[PDB]
Amino acid sequence: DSHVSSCSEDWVGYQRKCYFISTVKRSWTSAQNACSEHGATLAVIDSEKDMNFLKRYAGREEHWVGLKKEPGHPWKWSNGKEFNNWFNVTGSDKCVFLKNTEVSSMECEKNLYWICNKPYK
Amino acid sequence: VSSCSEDWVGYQRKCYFISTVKRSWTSAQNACSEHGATLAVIDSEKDMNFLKRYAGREEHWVGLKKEPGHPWKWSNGKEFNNWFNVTGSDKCVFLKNTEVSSMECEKNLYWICNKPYK
Ligand SMILES: [Cl-]
Ligand SMILES: [Cl-]
Ligand SMILES: [Cl-]
Ligand SMILES: [Cl-]
Ligand SMILES: [Cl-]
Ligand code: NA
Structure with missing residues (x-):
């Protein structure tokens, strides 16, 4: 078995996930x-480490991540995990973005950069 | 077997420690040498753009140092051909999202190591 675990070309590996910006x-x-075309979802955040990494990786520009709110349903991550509101999401919109100094929400139809992630083994 | 520690950041075949x-x-x-690494060597625009962005507002030491009288040298011994500019005239190089510059080597700054994927 010649396998060595990492992320593919143009993806970034951290804490057993692969990220794409x-x-x-x-x-x-x-x-x-676009994320699904490459076997990923908009980035899901499982820990404070993930959050710190994502904010830094995002830089100064707003980036969509995998958190969305539908009427009559709780906030949900793109991996199916319900969001337990362990961080604050400001604004007044359904779709979440972040940057190195903010986590907030914006109209889903707005054009923003994005970040995908996916688990790796 | 994995190419990088789960606590390092793997990008373009190098593992990074911030x-x-x-x-x-x-x-x-x-500190970097204690983990099989050196202060970061930057090989491409991609590497550079990634590092500057991730560093953010805070200055981070990288693996470049200039001794008066000697060529620019990366921390792995590779000569540096000045494909990017370094502002200032101090010996030790740092970067952040908006600059690549130099500072007195004694200053305390954050830093970045890299080493090849295993
Ligand atoms: Cl793209
Ligand atoms: Cl959660
Ligand atoms: Cl664009
Ligand atoms: Cl440290
Ligand atoms: Cl060079
Ligand atoms: Na990693």
Whole structure:
């Protein structure tokens, strides 16, 4: 078995996930679609480490991540885990973005950069 | 078997460590060597853009040092051909999201190590 575990070309490995940062701005839905084309979702955040890493990786520009609120349902991560509201999401919109100094929400149809992630083994 | 520690950041075939405390350039270099690494060597625009972005507002030492009288040298002994500019005239190089510059080696700054994927 010659396997060595890592992320693929152009993905970034941290804490057993592989991350991808977009080079263009698109709607939250288009971004989710782009992540799914590569076996990922908009980034899910499982820990304070993940959060600290994501904020730094995002840099100064707003980046969509995998957290969305539907009427009549709780906030949910793109991996199916319900969000336990362990951090605050400001604003007044359904789709979540972050940058190195903020986690907030914006109209889903707005074009923003995005970050995907996915587990690796 | 994995290419990098789960606590390091793997990108473009190198594993990166980003420090959580500030130390002198020499102290930082010694710290990297204790983990099979050197202060970060930057091989491409991609590497550079990633590092600057991740560093953020805070200065981070990288693996470049200029002794008056000697060529620019990376921490792995590779000569540096000045494909990016370093502002200032101090010996030790740091970067952050908005600059690549130099500072007195004794200053305490955060730092970044790298080493090849296993
Ligand atoms: Cl892209
Ligand atoms: Cl764009
Ligand atoms: Cl959660
Ligand atoms: Cl540290
Ligand atoms: Cl060079
Ligand atoms: Na890693």
